[PDB]
């Protein structure tokens, strides 16, 4: 389908906000 590529920024942003989550579970 041809629309808007916004999910790429959501997934890219999700990868940035999911880096410190591992450190939150180990502490």
Curated annotation (Swiss-Prot):
TM helices/strands, residue ranges: 3-21
Site description Cleavage, residues in chain: 9-10, 23-24
Topology of this chain in the membrane: Single-pass membrane protein; Single-pass type I membrane protein
Propeptide: 10-23
Location of this chain's protein in the cell: Host endoplasmic reticulum membrane; Host mitochondrion membrane
Descriptive protein name: Core protein precursor
Source organism (scientific name): Hepatitis C virus genotype 2a (isolate JFH-1)
Residue numbers of the full-length protein present here: 171 to 195 of 3033
